[PDB]
Amino acid sequence: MKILVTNDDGVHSPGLRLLYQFALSLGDVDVVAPESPKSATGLGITLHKPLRMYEVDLCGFRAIATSGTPSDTVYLATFGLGRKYDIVLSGINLGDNTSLQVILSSGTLGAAFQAALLGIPALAYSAYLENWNELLNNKEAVEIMGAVVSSTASYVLKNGMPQGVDVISVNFPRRLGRGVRAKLVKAAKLRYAQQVVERVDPRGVRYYWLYGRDLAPEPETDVYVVLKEGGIAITPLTLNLNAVDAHREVDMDSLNRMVEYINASLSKLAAALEHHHH
Amino acid sequence: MKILVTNDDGVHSPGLRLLYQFALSLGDVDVVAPESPKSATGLGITLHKPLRMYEVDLCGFRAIATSGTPSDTVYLATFGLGRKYDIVLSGINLGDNTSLQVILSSGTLGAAFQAALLGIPALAYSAYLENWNELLNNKEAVEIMGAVVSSTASYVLKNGMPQGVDVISVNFPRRLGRGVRAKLVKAAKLRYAQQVVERVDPRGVRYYWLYGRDLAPEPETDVYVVLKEGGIAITPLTLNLNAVDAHREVDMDSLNRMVEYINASLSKLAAALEHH
């Protein structure tokens, strides 16, 4: 299997390195990602200018950095490869990507969306963390995150995407302990309240902070499972935005079997983690 | 009715001025848009920095320019208004916005999308054009476009957004003549082929042009209606990306009535234009 590993926080992100390491057990892995953080490159297909691709050494392994957006990645990657990848894994985004409001403006999900539109299986991974050090220093947390990525990705590499699902988005909670389990859950519509904070800069010119307030999460939504339950949220997304198509079909049981496969791997792991640190 | 008019080509875009003019007959209009084009203003909620808003004299009318992305627009505009708008019209975008591939990367649609998540009726308008000159000097084409914007927006203002639809995206074909009509049609998946063109710059370093080749479209898709049929495509979009939800209610008769209304208006207009 040929696997594309990418992200939107920059080719130098520690989260991208982790994803690469987790994917090594699945097949031949290539890393291609934008050179800068999405706060520098916008979102969406680049039509106005050409792109550049270049090798970077993430010390221990090589990757290709691009001058494009995360949406451009799959196209550049496919071209670089000479053919389409068997699966695209996007992430280990620094920060959660819960709710449709965020999903729709996320470069992490943007890269998986274009891959999915090209008919390629796609998964996105995000972690509810403010920085990487906490995670990096927690061997166990890293192994659990790895078990989740490996099982979701291999389940898809083996069975294909569940019917009616284009992208599966995985969000990890702030604390990854041995009892953490995954749950199939839909995305909330909104994450951030509309409250705007108005201020005045040193020179008296007004400025505004948007999205400073979180809405209270509702049960059975990705936001709630991650923030309040501290569970791993697994969210199946469809890119069929056509309203005409109202009676759709999703293989719900295949989704449930994938989650059960994830939780079995987590149990097997927590079993081992004890007999060892016995 | 409080109408918000916006776009993603920049506050100085002639397309934004047309949309404002088309909207004046519907109610009280505010124009709020990013100062520069989406090919400079990213896409997506701005969290890393604060935003600015200031009055701009476009001559003939004023607007508020922002330093944000088209996605931040509705948030800023609503905060300024002090309450929600009754409808958001995005566009007279230069270039068509057909296919999911483009719809998901479009600032014109992004602005409408954020309005929809807030529960506000939203429409996006895009024109398959290279530049504004042709259009602006063709009075009849301008009247046809305005009749379509005007009929779609008042239909929604009067009847409400059809149940199950979050955004109605309208794409105008290259030629707008008296026989052009609208068709309710879904979005194709892709607009551009995956093909990448490789070149070498004068210093010997490779560079790459993406999306240089158009995919030939299938019938019954927005791309086909616009590029091949020369028709006006009307595409109802839902933002419910949740795959879980499979049986979703859509007021299809209302969408049909809306398209019929656009076509009845276009027929009356063609008759009038013949000095009737």
Coordinates of C-alpha atoms in Angstrom, one line a residue:
Chain A
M1 CA 0.0 0.0 0.0
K2 CA 1.2 3.5 -0.9
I3 CA 0.3 6.0 1.9
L4 CA 0.3 9.8 1.7
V5 CA 0.8 11.6 5.0
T6 CA 0.2 15.3 5.1
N7 CA -1.2 18.1 7.4
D8 CA -1.8 21.8 7.5
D9 CA 0.3 23.0 10.4
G10 CA 3.5 23.0 8.4
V11 CA 5.9 20.4 7.2
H12 CA 7.9 20.9 10.4
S13 CA 5.1 20.2 12.7
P14 CA 5.9 17.5 15.4
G15 CA 2.3 16.3 14.7
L16 CA 3.2 15.4 11.1
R17 CA 6.3 13.4 12.2
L18 CA 4.2 11.4 14.6
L19 CA 1.6 10.6 11.9
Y20 CA 4.5 9.5 9.6
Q21 CA 5.9 7.2 12.3
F22 CA 2.4 5.7 13.0
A23 CA 1.9 5.0 9.3
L24 CA 5.2 3.2 8.8
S25 CA 3.6 -0.1 9.9
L26 CA 1.0 0.2 7.1
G27 CA 2.9 0.4 3.9
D28 CA 5.2 2.7 1.9
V29 CA 4.8 6.2 3.3
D30 CA 5.4 9.5 1.5
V31 CA 5.2 12.8 3.3
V32 CA 4.1 15.8 1.3
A33 CA 2.8 19.0 3.0
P34 CA 2.7 22.8 2.7
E35 CA 5.9 24.5 3.9
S36 CA 4.1 27.0 6.1
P37 CA 1.2 26.9 8.7
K38 CA -2.3 27.3 7.3
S39 CA -2.3 30.7 9.0
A40 CA 0.0 31.7 6.1
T41 CA -1.5 29.7 3.2
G42 CA -5.2 30.1 2.7
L43 CA -7.6 27.2 2.2
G44 CA -8.7 25.9 -1.2
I45 CA -7.3 25.1 -4.6
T46 CA -4.6 27.4 -5.9
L47 CA -5.6 28.7 -9.4
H48 CA -3.8 32.1 -9.5
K49 CA -0.1 30.9 -9.4
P50 CA 2.1 27.9 -9.9
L51 CA 3.5 25.9 -7.0
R52 CA 7.0 24.8 -5.9
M53 CA 7.9 21.5 -4.3
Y54 CA 11.1 20.8 -2.4
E55 CA 12.8 18.2 -0.1
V56 CA 13.2 18.9 3.6
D57 CA 15.0 16.8 6.1
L58 CA 12.9 16.3 9.2
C59 CA 16.0 14.6 10.7
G60 CA 15.5 10.9 10.5
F61 CA 13.4 11.1 7.4
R62 CA 12.7 13.2 4.3
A63 CA 9.5 15.0 3.2
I64 CA 8.4 17.2 0.4
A65 CA 7.3 20.8 1.3
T66 CA 5.1 22.7 -1.1
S67 CA 4.3 26.4 -1.6
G68 CA 0.6 25.5 -1.9
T69 CA -2.5 25.1 0.4
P70 CA -3.5 21.8 2.0
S71 CA -6.1 21.3 -0.8
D72 CA -3.3 21.4 -3.4
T73 CA -1.4 18.6 -1.7
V74 CA -3.1 15.5 -3.1
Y75 CA -2.8 16.8 -6.7
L76 CA 1.0 17.6 -6.3
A77 CA 1.6 14.4 -4.4
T78 CA -0.2 12.3 -7.0
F79 CA 1.8 14.0 -9.7
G80 CA 5.0 13.4 -7.8
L81 CA 4.1 9.8 -7.4
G82 CA 3.0 9.1 -10.9
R83 CA -0.3 7.6 -9.6
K84 CA -3.0 7.9 -6.9
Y85 CA -2.3 6.9 -3.3
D86 CA -4.2 4.0 -1.6
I87 CA -5.0 6.3 1.4
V88 CA -4.4 9.8 2.5
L89 CA -3.9 10.4 6.3
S90 CA -4.0 14.1 7.2
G91 CA -2.6 15.4 10.3
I92 CA -2.1 15.1 13.8
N93 CA -3.3 18.6 13.8
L94 CA -2.4 20.7 16.9
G95 CA -5.9 21.5 18.0
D96 CA -9.2 19.8 17.7
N97 CA -11.3 20.1 14.5
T98 CA -14.7 19.5 16.0
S99 CA -18.0 20.9 14.6
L100 CA -19.0 21.7 11.0
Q101 CA -18.2 25.4 11.6
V102 CA -14.5 24.4 12.1
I103 CA -14.5 21.4 9.7
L104 CA -15.5 23.7 6.9
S105 CA -12.5 26.0 7.4
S106 CA -9.9 23.5 8.4
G107 CA -6.8 22.8 6.2
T108 CA -6.5 19.4 7.9
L109 CA -9.9 18.3 6.6
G110 CA -9.4 20.3 3.3
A111 CA -6.6 18.0 2.3
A112 CA -8.7 14.9 3.1
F113 CA -11.7 16.4 1.2
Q114 CA -9.8 16.9 -2.1
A115 CA -8.4 13.3 -1.7
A116 CA -11.9 12.0 -1.2
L117 CA -13.2 13.9 -4.2
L118 CA -10.5 12.0 -6.2
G119 CA -11.9 8.7 -5.0
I120 CA -9.1 8.2 -2.5
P121 CA -9.9 6.8 1.1
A122 CA -9.1 9.7 3.5
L123 CA -8.7 10.2 7.3
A124 CA -8.0 13.3 9.3
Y125 CA -6.5 13.3 12.9
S126 CA -6.5 16.1 15.3
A127 CA -5.6 16.4 18.9
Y128 CA -7.1 18.7 21.6
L129 CA -3.7 20.1 22.9
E130 CA -2.2 23.6 23.1
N131 CA 1.4 22.4 22.5
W132 CA 3.2 19.1 21.7
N133 CA 5.6 18.7 24.7
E134 CA 2.9 17.3 27.0
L135 CA 2.2 14.5 24.5
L136 CA 5.7 13.9 23.4
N137 CA 6.9 13.3 26.9
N138 CA 4.1 10.7 27.6
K139 CA 5.2 7.4 26.1
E140 CA 1.9 5.7 26.8
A141 CA -0.2 8.6 25.3
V142 CA 1.9 8.4 22.1
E143 CA 1.4 4.6 21.9
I144 CA -2.4 4.9 22.3
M145 CA -2.6 7.6 19.7
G146 CA -0.6 5.4 17.5
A147 CA -2.8 2.4 18.1
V148 CA -5.8 4.5 17.0
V149 CA -4.2 5.8 13.8
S150 CA -2.9 2.3 12.9
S151 CA -6.2 0.5 13.4
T152 CA -8.4 3.2 11.7
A153 CA -6.1 3.4 8.7
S154 CA -5.5 -0.4 8.4
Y155 CA -9.3 -1.1 8.8
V156 CA -9.8 1.3 5.8
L157 CA -6.9 0.0 3.8
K158 CA -8.4 -3.5 4.2
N159 CA -12.2 -2.8 3.8
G160 CA -12.4 0.4 1.9
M161 CA -14.4 3.4 3.3
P162 CA -17.8 2.5 4.7
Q163 CA -20.4 3.1 2.0
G164 CA -21.7 6.7 2.0
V165 CA -18.7 8.0 3.9
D166 CA -16.0 10.2 2.3
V167 CA -13.8 11.2 5.2
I168 CA -13.4 10.0 8.7
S169 CA -12.3 12.6 11.2
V170 CA -10.7 11.4 14.5
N171 CA -10.4 13.8 17.4
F172 CA -8.2 12.9 20.4
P173 CA -9.0 14.3 23.9
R174 CA -6.5 16.3 26.0
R175 CA -5.6 13.3 28.2
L176 CA -4.8 9.9 26.7
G177 CA -4.9 7.4 29.4
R178 CA -5.2 3.6 29.3
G179 CA -9.0 3.7 29.8
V180 CA -9.8 6.0 26.9
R181 CA -12.0 4.5 24.2
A182 CA -13.4 5.7 20.9
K183 CA -16.9 6.6 20.0
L184 CA -18.8 7.0 16.7
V185 CA -20.4 10.5 16.9
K186 CA -21.7 13.2 14.6
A187 CA -20.2 16.7 14.4
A188 CA -21.9 19.6 16.2
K189 CA -23.0 22.4 13.9
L190 CA -21.2 25.1 15.7
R191 CA -18.2 25.3 18.1
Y192 CA -17.9 29.0 18.7
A193 CA -20.5 31.5 19.8
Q194 CA -20.9 34.7 17.7
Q195 CA -19.7 37.0 20.5
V196 CA -17.3 39.7 19.2
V197 CA -14.8 41.4 21.5
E198 CA -14.0 45.0 20.5
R199 CA -10.8 46.8 21.6
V200 CA -8.7 49.8 20.7
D201 CA -5.1 49.5 19.7
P202 CA -2.3 51.8 21.1
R203 CA -3.1 54.4 18.4
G204 CA -6.8 54.4 19.1
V205 CA -7.9 52.3 16.1
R206 CA -10.6 49.7 16.9
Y207 CA -10.0 46.0 16.4
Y208 CA -12.1 42.9 16.9
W209 CA -11.5 39.4 18.3
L210 CA -13.9 36.8 16.9
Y211 CA -14.7 33.3 18.2
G212 CA -13.5 34.0 21.7
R213 CA -16.4 32.2 23.3
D214 CA -17.1 28.4 23.1
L215 CA -20.8 27.4 23.0
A216 CA -21.7 24.8 25.7
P217 CA -21.4 21.4 24.0
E218 CA -24.4 19.1 23.5
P219 CA -24.2 15.3 24.3
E220 CA -23.7 13.0 21.3
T221 CA -21.6 15.5 19.4
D222 CA -17.9 15.4 18.6
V223 CA -17.2 18.5 20.7
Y224 CA -18.9 17.0 23.8
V225 CA -17.1 13.6 23.5
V226 CA -13.7 15.3 23.3
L227 CA -14.1 18.2 25.7
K228 CA -16.5 16.9 28.3
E229 CA -16.3 13.1 28.0
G230 CA -12.5 13.0 27.3
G231 CA -13.2 10.3 24.8
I232 CA -11.8 9.8 21.2
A233 CA -14.4 11.0 18.7
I234 CA -14.7 9.2 15.4
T235 CA -16.8 11.3 12.9
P236 CA -17.9 10.0 9.5
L237 CA -18.3 12.8 6.9
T238 CA -20.0 12.9 3.6
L239 CA -19.1 15.5 0.9
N240 CA -22.3 15.1 -0.9
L241 CA -23.6 18.7 -0.4
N242 CA -26.3 18.3 -2.9
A243 CA -29.7 18.9 -1.2
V244 CA -31.5 17.2 -4.1
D245 CA -30.1 13.9 -2.8
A246 CA -32.2 13.4 0.4
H247 CA -32.5 9.6 0.7
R248 CA -28.9 8.6 1.1
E249 CA -27.4 5.4 2.2
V250 CA -24.7 4.8 4.8
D251 CA -23.4 1.5 5.9
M252 CA -23.9 2.2 9.5
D253 CA -22.8 -1.3 10.7
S254 CA -19.4 -1.0 9.0
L255 CA -18.8 2.2 10.9
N256 CA -19.7 0.4 14.2
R257 CA -17.4 -2.5 13.3
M258 CA -14.6 -0.1 12.7
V259 CA -15.1 1.5 16.1
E260 CA -15.2 -1.9 17.7
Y261 CA -12.0 -2.8 15.9
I262 CA -10.4 0.4 17.3
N263 CA -11.6 -0.3 20.9
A264 CA -10.3 -3.9 20.6
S265 CA -6.8 -2.6 19.7
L266 CA -7.0 -0.2 22.6
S267 CA -7.9 -3.0 25.0
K268 CA -5.2 -5.2 23.7
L269 CA -2.8 -2.4 24.1
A270 CA -3.8 -1.5 27.7
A271 CA -3.5 -5.2 28.5
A272 CA 0.1 -5.3 27.2
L273 CA 1.0 -1.9 28.8
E274 CA 0.3 -3.5 32.2
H275 CA 2.0 -6.9 31.9
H276 CA 5.0 -5.0 30.7
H277 CA 5.1 -2.1 33.3
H278 CA 4.2 -5.0 35.6
Chain B
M1 CA -35.8 43.2 5.2
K2 CA -32.1 43.6 6.2
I3 CA -29.9 42.4 3.4
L4 CA -26.2 41.8 3.7
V5 CA -24.3 41.9 0.3
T6 CA -20.7 40.6 0.3
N7 CA -18.2 38.8 -1.9
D8 CA -14.7 37.4 -2.0
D9 CA -13.0 39.2 -5.0
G10 CA -12.4 42.3 -2.9
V11 CA -14.5 45.3 -1.9
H12 CA -13.5 47.1 -5.2
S13 CA -14.8 44.3 -7.4
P14 CA -17.3 45.6 -10.0
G15 CA -19.2 42.3 -9.3
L16 CA -19.9 43.5 -5.8
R17 CA -21.2 46.9 -7.0
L18 CA -23.6 45.1 -9.4
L19 CA -24.9 42.8 -6.6
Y20 CA -25.5 45.8 -4.4
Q21 CA -27.5 47.5 -7.2
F22 CA -29.5 44.4 -7.9
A23 CA -30.3 44.2 -4.2
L24 CA -31.4 47.7 -3.6
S25 CA -35.0 47.0 -4.7
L26 CA -35.4 44.2 -2.1
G27 CA -34.9 46.2 1.2
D28 CA -32.2 47.9 3.3
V29 CA -28.8 46.8 2.1
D30 CA -25.4 46.7 3.9
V31 CA -22.2 45.9 2.0
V32 CA -19.4 44.4 4.0
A33 CA -16.6 42.5 2.3
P34 CA -12.8 41.7 2.7
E35 CA -10.6 44.5 1.4
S36 CA -8.6 42.2 -0.9
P37 CA -9.3 39.1 -3.0
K38 CA -9.5 35.6 -1.6
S39 CA -6.2 35.0 -3.4
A40 CA -4.6 37.0 -0.6
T41 CA -7.3 36.6 2.1
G42 CA -7.3 33.0 3.2
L43 CA -10.4 31.0 3.7
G44 CA -11.8 30.0 7.0
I45 CA -12.5 31.5 10.4
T46 CA -9.7 33.9 11.6
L47 CA -8.5 32.9 15.1
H48 CA -4.9 33.8 15.1
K49 CA -5.4 37.5 14.8
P50 CA -8.0 40.3 15.4
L51 CA -9.8 41.9 12.6
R52 CA -10.3 45.5 11.3
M53 CA -13.4 47.1 9.6
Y54 CA -13.5 50.5 8.0
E55 CA -15.7 52.5 5.7
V56 CA -14.7 52.7 2.0
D57 CA -16.2 55.1 -0.5
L58 CA -16.7 53.1 -3.7
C59 CA -18.4 56.1 -5.2
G60 CA -22.1 55.7 -5.7
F61 CA -22.2 54.0 -2.3
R62 CA -20.2 53.2 0.7
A63 CA -19.2 49.8 2.1
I64 CA -17.3 48.4 5.0
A65 CA -14.0 46.7 4.1
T66 CA -12.6 44.1 6.5
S67 CA -9.2 42.6 7.0
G68 CA -10.7 39.2 7.4
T69 CA -11.6 36.2 5.2
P70 CA -15.0 35.9 3.5
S71 CA -15.9 33.4 6.3
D72 CA -15.4 36.1 9.0
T73 CA -17.7 38.5 7.1
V74 CA -21.1 37.5 8.4
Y75 CA -19.7 37.5 12.0
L76 CA -18.3 41.0 11.6
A77 CA -21.4 42.3 9.7
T78 CA -23.8 40.9 12.3
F79 CA -21.9 42.3 15.2
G80 CA -22.0 45.7 13.4
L81 CA -25.7 45.5 12.7
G82 CA -26.4 44.4 16.2
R83 CA -28.6 41.5 15.2
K84 CA -29.0 39.0 12.4
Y85 CA -29.7 39.9 8.8
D86 CA -32.7 38.5 7.0
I87 CA -30.6 37.3 4.1
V88 CA -27.0 37.2 2.8
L89 CA -26.2 37.5 -0.9
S90 CA -22.7 36.7 -1.8
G91 CA -21.1 37.6 -5.0
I92 CA -21.3 38.4 -8.6
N93 CA -18.1 36.4 -8.3
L94 CA -15.8 36.7 -11.4
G95 CA -15.5 33.1 -12.5
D96 CA -18.0 30.2 -12.0
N97 CA -18.1 28.2 -8.8
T98 CA -19.3 24.9 -10.1
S99 CA -18.5 21.5 -8.6
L100 CA -17.9 20.4 -5.0
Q101 CA -14.1 20.6 -5.6
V102 CA -14.5 24.4 -6.1
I103 CA -17.5 24.9 -3.8
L104 CA -15.4 23.6 -0.9
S105 CA -12.6 26.0 -1.8
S106 CA -14.6 29.1 -2.6
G107 CA -14.6 32.2 -0.5
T108 CA -17.9 33.3 -2.3
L109 CA -19.5 30.1 -1.0
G110 CA -17.6 30.2 2.3
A111 CA -19.3 33.5 3.2
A112 CA -22.7 32.0 2.4
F113 CA -21.8 28.8 4.3
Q114 CA -21.1 30.7 7.6
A115 CA -24.3 32.7 7.1
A116 CA -26.1 29.3 6.8
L117 CA -24.6 27.8 9.9
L118 CA -26.0 30.8 11.7
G119 CA -29.4 30.0 10.4
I120 CA -29.5 32.8 7.9
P121 CA -30.9 32.4 4.3
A122 CA -28.0 32.6 1.9
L123 CA -27.4 32.8 -1.9
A124 CA -24.2 32.9 -3.9
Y125 CA -23.9 34.2 -7.4
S126 CA -21.0 33.5 -9.8
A127 CA -20.5 34.4 -13.5
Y128 CA -18.5 32.3 -16.0
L129 CA -16.6 35.4 -17.2
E130 CA -12.9 36.3 -17.8
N131 CA -13.3 40.0 -16.9
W132 CA -16.1 42.5 -16.2
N133 CA -15.8 44.6 -19.4
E134 CA -17.9 42.4 -21.7
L135 CA -20.7 42.2 -19.2
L136 CA -20.8 45.8 -18.0
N137 CA -21.1 47.1 -21.6
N138 CA -23.9 44.7 -22.4
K139 CA -27.0 46.3 -20.9
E140 CA -29.3 43.4 -21.8
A141 CA -27.0 40.8 -20.1
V142 CA -26.9 43.1 -17.0
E143 CA -30.7 43.3 -16.9
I144 CA -31.1 39.5 -17.2
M145 CA -28.6 38.9 -14.4
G146 CA -30.3 41.4 -12.2
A147 CA -33.7 39.8 -13.0
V148 CA -32.3 36.4 -11.8
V149 CA -30.6 37.8 -8.6
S150 CA -33.8 39.8 -7.9
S151 CA -36.2 36.9 -8.5
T152 CA -34.2 34.3 -6.4
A153 CA -33.6 36.7 -3.4
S154 CA -37.2 38.0 -3.3
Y155 CA -38.5 34.4 -3.6
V156 CA -36.5 33.5 -0.5
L157 CA -37.4 36.7 1.3
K158 CA -41.1 36.1 0.6
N159 CA -41.4 32.3 1.0
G160 CA -38.4 31.4 3.1
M161 CA -35.4 29.2 2.3
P162 CA -36.7 25.8 1.1
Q163 CA -36.5 23.3 4.0
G164 CA -33.3 21.2 4.0
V165 CA -31.4 23.7 1.8
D166 CA -28.7 25.9 3.4
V167 CA -27.3 27.7 0.4
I168 CA -28.6 28.3 -3.2
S169 CA -25.7 28.7 -5.6
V170 CA -26.4 30.4 -8.9
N171 CA -24.0 30.2 -11.8
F172 CA -24.4 32.4 -14.9
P173 CA -23.1 31.1 -18.3
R174 CA -20.7 33.1 -20.5
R175 CA -23.5 34.5 -22.8
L176 CA -26.6 36.0 -21.3
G177 CA -29.1 36.4 -24.1
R178 CA -32.9 36.6 -24.2
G179 CA -33.3 32.9 -24.6
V180 CA -31.1 31.9 -21.6
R181 CA -33.1 30.0 -18.9
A182 CA -32.4 28.5 -15.4
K183 CA -32.3 24.9 -14.4
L184 CA -32.3 23.2 -11.0
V185 CA -29.2 21.0 -11.0
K186 CA -26.8 19.3 -8.7
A187 CA -23.1 20.0 -8.4
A188 CA -20.6 17.7 -10.1
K189 CA -17.8 16.4 -7.9
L190 CA -15.0 17.8 -9.9
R191 CA -14.4 20.8 -12.2
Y192 CA -10.7 20.4 -12.9
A193 CA -8.8 17.4 -14.0
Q194 CA -5.9 16.2 -11.7
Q195 CA -3.4 16.9 -14.5
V196 CA -0.3 18.9 -13.4
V197 CA 1.9 20.8 -15.8
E198 CA 5.6 20.9 -15.0
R199 CA 7.9 23.7 -16.1
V200 CA 11.4 25.0 -15.4
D201 CA 11.9 28.6 -14.4
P202 CA 14.8 30.6 -16.0
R203 CA 17.0 29.7 -13.0
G204 CA 16.4 26.0 -13.6
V205 CA 14.0 25.3 -10.7
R206 CA 10.8 23.4 -11.4
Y207 CA 7.4 25.0 -10.9
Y208 CA 3.9 23.5 -11.3
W209 CA 0.6 24.6 -12.8
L210 CA -2.4 22.8 -11.3
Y211 CA -6.0 22.7 -12.6
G212 CA -5.0 23.7 -16.0
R213 CA -7.3 21.3 -17.7
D214 CA -11.2 21.3 -17.4
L215 CA -12.8 18.0 -16.8
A216 CA -15.5 17.3 -19.6
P217 CA -18.7 17.4 -17.4
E218 CA -21.5 14.8 -17.2
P219 CA -25.1 15.8 -18.1
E220 CA -27.3 17.0 -15.3
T221 CA -24.5 18.7 -13.3
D222 CA -23.9 22.4 -12.7
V223 CA -20.7 22.3 -14.8
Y224 CA -22.5 20.8 -17.8
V225 CA -25.5 23.3 -17.6
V226 CA -23.1 26.2 -17.5
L227 CA -20.3 25.2 -19.9
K228 CA -22.1 23.0 -22.4
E229 CA -25.8 24.1 -22.3
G230 CA -25.1 27.8 -21.8
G231 CA -27.8 27.7 -19.1
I232 CA -28.1 29.3 -15.6
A233 CA -27.5 26.6 -13.0
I234 CA -29.3 26.8 -9.7
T235 CA -27.8 24.4 -7.2
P236 CA -29.3 23.8 -3.7
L237 CA -26.6 22.9 -1.1
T238 CA -26.9 21.4 2.4
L239 CA -24.0 21.8 4.9
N240 CA -25.0 18.7 6.8
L241 CA -21.8 16.8 6.3
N242 CA -22.8 14.2 8.8
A243 CA -23.0 10.8 7.1
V244 CA -24.9 9.4 10.0
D245 CA -28.0 11.4 8.9
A246 CA -29.1 9.6 5.7
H247 CA -32.9 10.4 5.3
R248 CA -33.0 14.2 5.0
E249 CA -36.1 16.3 4.2
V250 CA -35.9 18.8 1.3
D251 CA -38.7 21.0 0.1
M252 CA -38.2 20.1 -3.6
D253 CA -41.5 21.6 -4.7
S254 CA -40.4 25.0 -3.3
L255 CA -37.1 24.7 -5.1
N256 CA -39.1 24.0 -8.4
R257 CA -41.4 26.9 -7.7
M258 CA -38.4 29.2 -7.3
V259 CA -36.8 28.1 -10.6
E260 CA -40.2 28.4 -12.3
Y261 CA -40.4 31.9 -10.9
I262 CA -36.9 32.9 -12.3
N263 CA -37.9 31.5 -15.7
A264 CA -41.3 33.2 -15.7
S265 CA -39.4 36.5 -14.9
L266 CA -36.9 35.8 -17.7
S267 CA -39.8 35.2 -20.1
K268 CA -41.6 38.4 -19.2
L269 CA -38.2 40.3 -19.5
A270 CA -37.4 38.9 -23.0
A271 CA -40.8 40.0 -24.1
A272 CA -40.4 43.5 -22.7
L273 CA -36.9 43.9 -24.1
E274 CA -38.3 43.4 -27.6
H275 CA -39.7 46.9 -27.0
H276 CA -43.0 44.9 -26.6

